Amino acid sequence: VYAWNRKRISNCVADYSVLYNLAPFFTFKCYGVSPTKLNDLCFTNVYADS
Amino acid sequence: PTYGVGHQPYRVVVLSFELLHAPATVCGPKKSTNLVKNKCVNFNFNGLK
Amino acid sequence: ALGKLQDVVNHNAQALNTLVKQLSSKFGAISSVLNDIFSRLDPPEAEVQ
Q: Where is this region: Disordered (chain B)?
């Protein structure tokens, strides 16, 4: 947690279905966008932290 | 595993975005089509519906 | 000499132009554009904003 990782995601097709429908992700809650509206919109400056 | 729930290690991932204020790179599975001129239509350029 | 009538004209133009400028006020919502709000929220959240 103190040394978390930051990752750049770019030039890729957005397919949240293959993550939303995956079993182990029991918590899918978003703040600025609806959980089911991801596939309908384009994105840039996309980052992920682990 | 002997510790009860709420103490187990939980992997957390967060996703950041900006919305429509920059040229988009990542797009969804939607399909494009040719534009039109001089006709009352509706358009979906990058998200600005 | 006859600025009394120009005052009426200017008052009308300003009053009718503040309305046009007013649409760019988010009024406590995420953004002042209807389409984005409806395209980035679940039915329930959208109604509130």
A: 21-43
